[PDB]
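Subject: Predicted fold for Kinesin-like protein KIF11, 332 residues

User T.R. writes:
Posting the sequence so we have a shared reference for the thread.
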Amino acid sequence: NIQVVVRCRPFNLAERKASAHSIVECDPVRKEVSVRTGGLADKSSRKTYTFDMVFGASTKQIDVYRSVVCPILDEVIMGYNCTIFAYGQTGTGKTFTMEGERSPNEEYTWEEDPLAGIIPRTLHQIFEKLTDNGTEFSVKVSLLEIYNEELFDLLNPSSDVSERLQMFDDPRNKRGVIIKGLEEITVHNKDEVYQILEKGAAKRTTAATLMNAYSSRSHSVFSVTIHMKETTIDGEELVKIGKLNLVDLAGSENNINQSLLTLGRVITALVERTPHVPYRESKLTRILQDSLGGRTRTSIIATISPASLNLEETLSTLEYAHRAKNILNKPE
Ligand SMILES: Nc1ncnc2c1ncn2[C@@H]1O[C@H](COP(=O)(O)OP(=O)(O)O)[C@@H](O)[C@H]1O
Ligand SMILES: CCOC(=O)C1=C(C)NC(=S)N[C@H]1c1cccc(O)c1
Ligand SMILES: [Mg+2]
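User M.O. replies:
I've generated the structure tokens; pasting them so everyone works from the same file.
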């Protein structure tokens, strides 16, 4: 089964002043998420769900990485393909979890910033883990985004944010596709990571100015490919290639996101073991087909809010994530 975890965001200053009380309770020991759906103080009703891991509002970035990503990166380094999806309503922490932010007032360098998310921590760790273990390696990254079923390359420095990419089936891969023009940037060392990320961020700002609700309606796929070569004591070369897809999905809240709709239908088809799985019905599911009931080790981080105002969407997200737990994958 694929791994499904839940992360609740902490209250913001506005909610803090309103003396808001959380309707979400996370028990890491029991690995459960309990939501107050009604009831008055001394008695109420609740909805509880169990997941592989649960992270409360106070969970720090480093702990999400240690608990969820560390094991996944080790697998990527073993030469397997892995994917991590961030799913949930806009404003619940998908981007904070997948990307992170900078601590205010330049208190920390990017490498030591406690607010850094999965992407920067992962890139930094790859270089650390392969510092001198005898494995020669190269790291390449790409950032593909889907908006209104159109494809954009956020790491191409010479292309206009208006330029769309074309997708084709891979002749030498039945369930694979080729994204013509998608640029792969080589990360030569840890000291090249931040600037590369900043460039993509700058280009996304241009995208936001041009496309409506870009940050919430778009799907982003940040891919890291590690080509590795080991040489045995007898001179033989051992090759392994690991790939990690870090996906920040469009907000799940209740116009017409074909890829988001298709992702849900694919999950339903997989869990209900229906013969036909509609992978080809959206660009997102075609690109990530192997991550959904395929040979890629997949994990989903469902993000929720502690505010009573978001009760309906929170329950929807939990029900969606809990169902996804039934998806079966077959690693390499
Ligand atoms: N774990 C967290 N700790 C501190 N702040 C968080 C956390 N998660 C989310 N936030 C804050 O909550 C807001 C949620 O925004 P964001 O990450 O962009 O959500 P989304 O991508 O799901 O729309 C941001 O301002 C972010 O800084
Ligand atoms: C200009 C600020 O940029 C950022 O915060 C980030 C960018 C560009 N890209 C990603 S994936 N994550 C953010 C990030 C990167 C490194 C350390 C951090 O603490 C936060
Ligand atoms: Mg976001």
